[PDB]
Motif scaffolding. Structure first.
Motif, PDB file in Angstrom:
ATOM      1  N   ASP A  52       0.817  -1.206   0.000  1.00 44.12           N
ATOM      2  CA  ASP A  52       0.000   0.000   0.000  1.00 44.12           C
ATOM      3  C   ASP A  52       0.861   1.271   0.000  1.00 44.12           C
ATOM      4  OD1 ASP A  52      -2.215  -1.762   0.271  1.00 44.12           O
ATOM      5  OD2 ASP A  52      -2.647  -1.142   2.324  1.00 44.12           O
ATOM      6  N   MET A  53       2.025   1.213   0.655  1.00 42.04           N
ATOM      7  CA  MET A  53       2.946   2.355   0.679  1.00 42.04           C
ATOM      8  C   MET A  53       3.399   2.758  -0.730  1.00 42.04           C
ATOM      9  SD  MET A  53       5.382   1.595   4.021  1.00 42.04           S
ATOM     10  CE  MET A  53       5.815  -0.078   3.549  1.00 42.04           C
ATOM     11  N   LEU A  54       3.753   1.777  -1.549  1.00 40.97           N
ATOM     12  CA  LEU A  54       4.235   2.054  -2.911  1.00 40.97           C
ATOM     13  C   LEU A  54       3.068   2.377  -3.844  1.00 40.97           C
ATOM     14  CD1 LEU A  54       6.352   2.328  -5.115  1.00 40.97           C
ATOM     15  CD2 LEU A  54       6.699  -0.128  -5.094  1.00 40.97           C
ATOM     16  N   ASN A  55       1.926   1.726  -3.635  1.00 43.60           N
ATOM     17  CA  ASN A  55       0.696   2.020  -4.391  1.00 43.60           C
ATOM     18  C   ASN A  55       0.316   3.495  -4.215  1.00 43.60           C
ATOM     19  OD1 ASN A  55      -1.693   1.707  -5.858  1.00 43.60           O
ATOM     20  ND2 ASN A  55      -2.455   0.045  -4.588  1.00 43.60           N
ATOM     21  N   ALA A  56       0.339   3.956  -2.964  1.00 42.10           N
ATOM     22  CA  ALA A  56       0.067   5.356  -2.630  1.00 42.10           C
ATOM     23  C   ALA A  56       1.034   6.307  -3.328  1.00 42.10           C
ATOM     24  CB  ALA A  56       0.120   5.558  -1.136  1.00 42.10           C
ATOM     25  N   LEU A  57       2.327   6.003  -3.240  1.00 44.58           N
ATOM     26  CA  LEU A  57       3.360   6.834  -3.895  1.00 44.58           C
ATOM     27  C   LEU A  57       3.121   6.978  -5.384  1.00 44.58           C
ATOM     28  CD1 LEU A  57       6.494   5.436  -2.106  1.00 44.58           C
ATOM     29  CD2 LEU A  57       5.693   7.777  -1.845  1.00 44.58           C
ATOM     30  N   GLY A 123      11.265  -5.521  -4.901  1.00 47.17           N
ATOM     31  CA  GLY A 123      11.253  -6.975  -4.910  1.00 47.17           C
ATOM     32  C   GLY A 123      11.631  -7.530  -6.266  1.00 47.17           C
ATOM     33  N   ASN A 124      10.912  -8.560  -6.706  1.00 44.93           N
ATOM     34  CA  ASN A 124      11.168  -9.137  -8.014  1.00 44.93           C
ATOM     35  C   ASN A 124      10.561  -8.289  -9.129  1.00 44.93           C
ATOM     36  OD1 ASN A 124       8.422  -9.747  -7.873  1.00 44.93           O
ATOM     37  ND2 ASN A 124       8.698 -11.968  -7.928  1.00 44.93           N
ATOM     38  N   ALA A 125       9.809  -7.248  -8.752  1.00 36.57           N
ATOM     39  CA  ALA A 125       9.265  -6.293  -9.706  1.00 36.57           C
ATOM     40  C   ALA A 125       8.334  -6.924 -10.742  1.00 36.57           C
ATOM     41  CB  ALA A 125      10.399  -5.549 -10.408  1.00 36.57           C
ATOM     42  N   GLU A 126       7.666  -8.015 -10.381  1.00 36.68           N
ATOM     43  CA  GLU A 126       6.780  -8.740 -11.306  1.00 36.68           C
ATOM     44  C   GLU A 126       5.327  -8.493 -10.903  1.00 36.68           C
ATOM     45  OE1 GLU A 126       7.739 -12.934 -11.367  1.00 36.68           O
ATOM     46  OE2 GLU A 126       9.869 -12.603 -11.789  1.00 36.68           O
ATOM     47  N   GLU A 149      15.140  -1.691   3.126  1.00 35.71           N
ATOM     48  CA  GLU A 149      15.822  -0.738   2.229  1.00 35.71           C
ATOM     49  C   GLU A 149      14.833   0.252   1.601  1.00 35.71           C
ATOM     50  OE1 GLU A 149      18.047  -3.451  -0.320  1.00 35.71           O
ATOM     51  OE2 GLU A 149      19.681  -3.626   1.100  1.00 35.71           O
ATOM     52  N   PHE A 150      13.697  -0.259   1.149  1.00 33.84           N
ATOM     53  CA  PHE A 150      12.628   0.583   0.615  1.00 33.84           C
ATOM     54  C   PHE A 150      12.129   1.593   1.636  1.00 33.84           C
ATOM     55  CE2 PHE A 150       8.069   1.343   0.353  1.00 33.84           C
ATOM     56  CZ  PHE A 150       7.981   1.973  -0.875  1.00 33.84           C
ATOM     57  N   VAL A 151      11.802   1.118   2.832  1.00 34.14           N
ATOM     58  CA  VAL A 151      11.219   1.982   3.824  1.00 34.14           C
ATOM     59  C   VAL A 151      12.276   2.971   4.395  1.00 34.14           C
ATOM     60  CG1 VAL A 151      11.388   0.679   6.001  1.00 34.14           C
ATOM     61  CG2 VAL A 151       9.267   1.867   5.393  1.00 34.14           C
ATOM     62  N   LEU A 159      13.616   8.077  -2.197  1.00 34.60           N
ATOM     63  CA  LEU A 159      12.940   7.356  -3.284  1.00 34.60           C
ATOM     64  C   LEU A 159      12.819   8.296  -4.476  1.00 34.60           C
ATOM     65  CD1 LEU A 159      10.103   5.470  -1.429  1.00 34.60           C
ATOM     66  CD2 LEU A 159      12.104   4.416  -2.506  1.00 34.60           C
ATOM     67  N   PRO A 160      12.717   7.719  -5.677  1.00 29.83           N
ATOM     68  CA  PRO A 160      12.645   8.552  -6.876  1.00 29.83           C
ATOM     69  C   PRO A 160      11.201   8.985  -7.199  1.00 29.83           C
ATOM     70  CG  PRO A 160      12.939   6.277  -7.514  1.00 29.83           C
ATOM     71  CD  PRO A 160      12.946   6.293  -6.006  1.00 29.83           C
TER      72      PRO A 160
END
Length: 243
Positions: A52-57, A123-126, A149-151, A159-160
């Motif tokens: 949800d953190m990355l979805n929000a971003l 992650g595996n980015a899939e 690492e992400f958080v 983060l980009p």
């Protein structure tokens, strides 16, 4: 460097809760591993609600929503009673209200979602072909090391994504605050599999502003009391003098 930390006491905390788990701590660029199942640190799991953190971003960066938007509950009973109301993206973050994050994912769409997830390299980015559940049931998987690492990057605004977008997502994640220390984070639980995975991923902001990031990853069971992830985390952070 990634290394096993001073672990005698924390290993014992995990055994005492009858679980198999790892706690990954990142301070600066040093990562230490604690717990009774350290191999979990490099094992891939579904991110479940932690995505949800990355979805929000992604959603905010691409203006598919904003922090004031009220997502409407149409009246259907949901998996949990707490989710049965209109709510903002930030309230949905706190509650891990999946229907809201599924709605957002569909706005983003498969093309943009896969492009962004690949760019971030989460992650595996899939993400496969199903835009609305790839973080819940696969194919997207991520290791606890990758999550810390992400958080850590989120916490440091590295983060980009736009600075404002990162600040706005950080602001949705505050869990607890006392004695000048703030704890931010996000829980997750993949309940519907043979090996249930529990996540608690976030960071401590210490009084001087220093950031210590964490990712707790453990095997869950239905019989476990509700607070178990938070309880193990806080015990371990105190023992390591992070709080």
């Amino acid at each position: 460097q990634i290394v096993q930390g001073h672990n005698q006491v924390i290993h014992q905390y995990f055994d005492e809760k009858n679980t198999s788990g790892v706690l990954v701590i990142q301070t600066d660029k040093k990562i230490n591993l604690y717990g009774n199942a350290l191999s979990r640190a490099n094992t891939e799991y579904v991110p479940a609600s932690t995505f949800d953190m990355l979805n929000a971003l992604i959603g905010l960066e691409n203006q598919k929503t904003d922090i004031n938007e009220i997502f409407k509950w149409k009246g259907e009973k949901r998996l949990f009673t707490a989710w049965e109301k209109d709510m903002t993206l930030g309230e949905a973050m706190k509650l891990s209200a999946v229907p809201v994050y599924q709605e957002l994912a569909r706005r983003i769409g498969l093309d943009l979602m896969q492009k962004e997830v690949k760019r971030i390299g989460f992650g595996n980015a899939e993400i496969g072909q199903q835009v609305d559940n790839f973080w819940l049931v696969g194919p997207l998987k991520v290791t606890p090391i990758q999550e810390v690492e992400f958080v850590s990057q989120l916490a440091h605004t590295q983060l980009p994504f736009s600075e404002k977008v990162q600040a706005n997502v950080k602001n949705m994640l505050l869990l607890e605050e006392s004695n000048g220390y703030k704890i931010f984070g996000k829980t997750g639980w993949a309940m519907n599999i043979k090996s249930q995975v529990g996540w608690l991923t976030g960071w401590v902001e210490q009084p001087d502003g220093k950031i210590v990031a964490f990712a707790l990853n453990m095997e869950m069971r239905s019989e476990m009391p509700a607070s178990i992830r938070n309880e193990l985390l806080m015990k371990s952070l105190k023992q390591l003098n992070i709080i």
